[PDB]
Structure of Gem-associated protein 5:
Amino acid sequence: QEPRTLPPSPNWYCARCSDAVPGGLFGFAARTSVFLVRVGPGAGESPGTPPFRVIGELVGHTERVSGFTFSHHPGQYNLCATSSDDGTVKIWDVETKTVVTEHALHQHTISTLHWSPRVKDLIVSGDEKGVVFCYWFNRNDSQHLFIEPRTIFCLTCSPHHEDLVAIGYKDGIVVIIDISKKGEVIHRLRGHDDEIHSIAWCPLPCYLATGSKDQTIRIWSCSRGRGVMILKLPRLWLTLHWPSNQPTQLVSSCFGGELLQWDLTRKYTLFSQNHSRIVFNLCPLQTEDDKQLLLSTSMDRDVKCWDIATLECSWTLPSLGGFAYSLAFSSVDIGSLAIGVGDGMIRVWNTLSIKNNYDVKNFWQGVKSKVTALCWHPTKEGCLAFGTDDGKVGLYDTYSNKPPQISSTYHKKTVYTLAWGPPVSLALYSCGGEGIVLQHNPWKLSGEAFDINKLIRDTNSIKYKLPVHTEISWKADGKIMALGNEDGSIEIFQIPNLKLICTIQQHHKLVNTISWHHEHGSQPELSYLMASGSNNAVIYVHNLKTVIESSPESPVTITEPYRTLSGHTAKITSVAWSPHHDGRLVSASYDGTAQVWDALREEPLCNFRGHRGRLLCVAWSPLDPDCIYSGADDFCVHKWLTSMQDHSRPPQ
Ligand SMILES: CN1CN([C@@H]2O[C@H](COP(=O)(O)OP(=O)(O)OP(=O)(O)O)[C@@H](O)[C@H]2O)c2nc(N)[nH]c(=O)c21
């Protein structure tokens, strides 16, 4: 297939942090970025597959992006403006994905901006103190305005005269100002009782609409400054869209993210598959093929498309609300990719959706915190173990509707590893940051869970305190278990009773990740290859085929590696052997890259730099050999191709 991006959620409680220009380009603000989605025929997808593609990220802001508006002037649809809590308002070109200009005029946290419908280079920004700036970027000018000492929530330039701008406030007040008259208040619009969420001008000449947290929409005659009709709706963000096609109809959000189309001529109509939590923005987009769509962003972290002719949802783009901590592919369901997210939901992604590139199912029940580990049962379908940062281990029947089973036992600290292995029918092993590895019974998960350090102590000859275990990986045949430790040690234990056969002292810091090379290779000696990463940059590979066959009486110490992979410049969070190759490793690092290695020749192959933060996990696509999935603390998962990469090594 082609690349995909599982992007961060659109930001919440912003009057305008997303917009769309006609033809088919949609942009929404998410974390520190603006993500770009070409929507329509020009997105290039099979008739049946939803016509959208995430194509671009606008990279450059330092803190939360508070506002985003496109330039809607014909032949200039490629410009757009952003505001950010870093005090910046940047002008962007979407073809280059770069900044054209900016201004740090605002001395207080910006609330919103808006690109004038009439003046080709005028962007009007307002902050939480009530200060409004006007910025003409092609003429290099900047008019300062102060209207009143109140918290600006929204701001909409008039489509019908260059000088009028409506401003809504946290306390319900709405006013219309004139820039050419130095911010004079022309119309005070008295009526609202609470937070103004949106202001939409009538598209034909003038009237004016406002949605407020006081559960009413209001239309105003901006001539006689009076309110000529009030609409009460049947937790709330109340955003509006006045369609140019139906100048007599009006779209609004409603409780629970429900969307309405009212009739100006007490009457409403329902959309639809609907949103489940409050909706923040609504963006009209007319495709090349003349379809009238409307894009909606929502607290439920879905980005939905609506066909205004049918008022049904054409597709949904889901998003991630926290770090992508974990990626697990199922061996029973081949395309099934489990994602552990910091926002407390597991994502299972059918990466083989015949007619849907983002077929993702969320799992709310049971989980109530950062999912930091995941593992599929090797044989049972739908069987998915997860661990959290509250130390909770859990099991999940992902075909079922029903809330998961929780282990009666919690780890003291975060759950970083989960592996299935034989009991010491199949047992769940969970490792916590405190250093305990526990053995769970899936049959009776509420019962006793045995800390395996007691058997390690019984079956070996111990007179010291055991290490703090930080990572567990079983070998492919289910006969050798490796534990990584805080000191950097890795310990090799043999099948029935965790007999220790070997200790590797190669790392000098905490081990984060161990992976054994797969058995499906084209040669035996490879399944005994172990890859490991620690809080240091250098990755090691070790060849344990001697000591496992040697089956020693006493445990042996190893101080020399089989292969050394230097390149990364920060800790290694995850490593994975390619299932389609022999000795090909991918590694995720805190240096924000992922490196593909041919581990046998100590050769760097390619380096993925598409992430915007520290990487936490990597998983090879189980069917495409040049395709890999990544997860980082940028609230993203990228599905990228080895062959599309520009660099072979990690930076420095
Ligand atoms: C403490 N860690 C951290 N860690 C790796 O680091 C990532 C983030 O962990 P974290 O909760 O930020 O731990 P922390 O030490 O605070 O991270 P940092 O100090 O780098 O910010 C995880 O995705 C995980 O792969 C770990 N992995 C294993 N196996 N065992 C561990 O004890 C730990």
The longest strand covers residues 279-286. The CA atoms of residues 81 and 91 lie 4 Å apart. The radius of gyration is 28 Å. The pocket of MGT is lined by residues 325, 414, 416-417, 433, 470-471, 510, 512, 573, 616 (CB under 6 Å).
